């Protein structure tokens, strides 16, 4: 599995996200509860967690391969992702394989992504 | 299943994007120039243009397989995503494999993704 060649623009520092209570938060200030509340109000969307099992360098430049356990039943998915790709980790906040690189592209502060990190995402119900 | 980078960025709905020049634009109001006008601005930022070479349905319902020619060297890359995944197309704007579904989920006007479409984004030089 190979990730989309493009990243969503809202990762840029200073970008504003629209929260479910009508709230607007700067992308760097996002919290887990923001995802939770946004999914809760939305009839269309639900929250989904993916635990990181393994992290490894790819054969392609600026790309790392990450094994995820996706959702309930822990579905096994390996994806080639850019080392700069920010993930939002449960109880942690923004995390990428190359935080310093994320700081260059999006100027987004990131923890180092590690095994055991639970990545939260918005998904369909 | 689908790993976090594969999933559509549903939290981009109603977002306000911060451009590299310091300008602000609502996500639905983004233009191709905004990617290009921000291309020359810094040293690290660069425009990655991935041309869709193929669009095929997948055995998985509501999922499409897209082949891209990626970057300057035109690397062949196959990506499996939900049909409503937004891409920003050169001279077109927001597009996906299911414009109607993208419009409902992301609350934006959406065109149809085509084998001619050039998908653009911000990557590193």
Curated annotation (Swiss-Prot), chains A, B:
Question: Any idea where this protein resides?
Answer: Cytoplasm; Nucleus
Induction (UniProt): ATXN1 protein levels are directly regulated by PUM1 protein: PUM1 acts by binding to the 3'-UTR of ATXN1 mRNA, affecting ATXN1 mRNA stability and leading to reduced ATXN1 protein levels.
Q: Organism's domain of life?
A: Eukaryota
Chain ranges of the AXH domain: 3-125
Cross-link Glycyl lysine isopeptide (Lys-Gly) (interchain with G-Cter in SUMO) maps to: 46
Q: In which tissues is it expressed?
A: Widely expressed throughout the body.
Please outline how this chain is modified post-translation: Ubiquitinated by UBE3A, leading to its degradation by the proteasome. The presence of expanded poly-Gln repeats in spinocerebellar ataxia 1 (SCA1) patients impairs ubiquitination and degradation, leading to accumulation of ATXN1 in neurons and subsequent toxicity.
Domain characteristics, as noted in the entry: The AXH domain is required for interaction with CIC.
By sequence similarity, the record places it as follows: Belongs to the ATXN1 family.
Please describe the quaternary structure of this protein.
Homooligomer. Interacts with CIC. Interacts with ANP32A, PQBP1, UBQLN4, ATXN1L and USP7. Directly interacts with RBPJ; this interaction is disrupted in the presence of Notch intracellular domain. Competes with ATXN1L for RBPJ-binding. Found in a complex with CIC and ATXN1L.
Associated disorder is:
Spinocerebellar ataxia 1: Spinocerebellar ataxia is a clinically and genetically heterogeneous group of cerebellar disorders. Patients show progressive incoordination of gait and often poor coordination of hands, speech and eye movements, due to cerebellum degeneration with variable involvement of the brainstem and spinal cord.
Q: What else is known?
A: Self-association seems to be necessary for formation of nuclear aggregates which are associated with pathogenesis.
Describe its function: Chromatin-binding factor that repress Notch signaling in the absence of Notch intracellular domain by acting as a CBF1 corepressor. Binds to the HEY promoter and might assist, along with NCOR2, RBPJ-mediated repression. Binds RNA in vitro. May be involved in RNA metabolism. In concert with CIC and ATXN1L, involved in brain development.
What is the recorded name of this protein? Ataxin-1
User: What is the protein's species of origin?
Assistant: Homo sapiens
